From Swiss-Prot:
Protein's gene: BRD1
Record lineage: Eukaryota, Metazoa, Chordata, Craniata, Vertebrata
Name of the protein in its database record: Bromodomain-containing protein 1
Tissue: Highly expressed in testis.
Subunit structure and binding partners: Component of some HBO1 complex composed of KAT7/HBO1, MEAF6, ING4 and BRD1/BRPF2. Component of the MOZ/MORF complex composed at least of ING5, KAT6A, KAT6B, MEAF6 and one of BRPF1, BRD1/BRPF2 and BRPF3. Interacts (via PHD-type zinc finger domain) with unmodified histone H3. Interacts (via PWWP domain) with dimethylated and trimethylated 'Lys-79' on histone H3.
Occurrences of domain Bromo (ranges): 9-113
Task performed by this protein: Scaffold subunit of various histone acetyltransferase (HAT) complexes, such as the MOZ/MORF and HBO1 complexes, that acts as a regulator of hematopoiesis. Plays a key role in HBO1 complex by directing KAT7/HBO1 specificity towards histone H3 'Lys-14' acetylation (H3K14ac), thereby promoting erythroid differentiation.
Superkingdom classification of source: Eukaryota
Location within or outside the cell: Nucleus; Chromosome
Glycyl lysine isopeptide (Lys-Gly) (interchain with G-Cter in SUMO2) crosslink location in chain: K41
Length: 121
């Protein structure tokens, strides 16, 4: 139907906007601490601690399959990246600190993304 096409165009345009959001958030991680999944070869106990691992590459895979239906879903996955790290790693670590800085800097980007998603519909 034409309605199904229109909906698909909206999803494609959301995907476009989320791709730009993803790029901007990932620039706030110049160390690339969050770029890839935590390695279970290198942290074999990880899944005992963290039940829903997340990372920027995994988000990018979902994004390119048009797998985020709305900004809330995308924000859920970004918050997982941050929150997983702040639980597994202690406060005094470069990992925890990187997550705090990513959260703080990402807030700015996400605040305007929400306005754009509501604004453009």
């Amino acid at each position: 139907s034409m309605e199904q096409v229109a909906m698909e165009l909206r999803l494609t345009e959301l995907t476009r906007l989320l791709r730009s959001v993803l790029d901007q958030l990932q620039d706030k991680d110049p160390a690339r601490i969050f770029a890839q999944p935590v390695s279970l070869k290198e942290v074999p106990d990880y899944l005992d601690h963290i039940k829903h691992p997340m990372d920027f590459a995994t988000m990018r895979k979902r994004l390119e399959a048009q797998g985020y239906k709305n900004l809330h879903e995308f924000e859920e996955d970004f918050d997982l990246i941050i929150d997983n790290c702040m639980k597994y790693n202690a406060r005094d670590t470069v990992f925890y600190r990187a997550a705090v800085r990513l959260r703080d800097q990402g807030g700015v980007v996400l605040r305007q993304a929400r306005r754009e998603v509501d604004s453009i519909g």
